[PDB]
């Protein structure tokens, strides 16, 4: 497994019951968010760790056909059956780098 891209972002999940975003893992702050590629089965996943204490706040697969939504210039999002993930990037450049890596990953799947 190899990191193909990384960006700084505050990782959020959507609390549908209350119609609100909450910090992934319980506390607000920036994480280093990677896309990892695993050879052999050709899989990708997003893995993010809090800069402060290395808490893993996101670890989710990227399936073929995932719909990655660039809601704003610095907030991007996607879903699975259980929850909706959001990345609040530290800059538009961080967001564009991550998005381009994600979209190219979806082309390799």
């Amino acid at each position: 497994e190899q990191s193909i891209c990384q960006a700084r972002a505050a990782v959020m999940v959507y609390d549908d019951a209350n119609k609100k975003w909450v910090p992934a893992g319980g506390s607000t702050g920036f994480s280093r968010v990677h896309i990892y590629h695993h050879t052999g089965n050709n899989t990708f996943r997003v893995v993010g760790r809090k800069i402060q204490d290395h808490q893993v706040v996101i670890n989710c697969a990227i399936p073929k056909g995932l719909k990655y939504n660039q809601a704003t210039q610095t907030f991007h999002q996607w879903r699975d059956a259980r929850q909706v993930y959001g990345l609040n990037f530290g800059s538009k450049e961080d967001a564009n780098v991550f998005a381009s890596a994600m979209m190219h990953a979806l082309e390799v799947l």
Binding site: Y14, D16, K19, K67, N69, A71, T72, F75, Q77, R79
Partner: peptide, 4 residues
């Protein structure tokens, strides 16, 4: 997707 939900809004921000």
């Amino acid at each position: 997707x939900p809004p921000x």
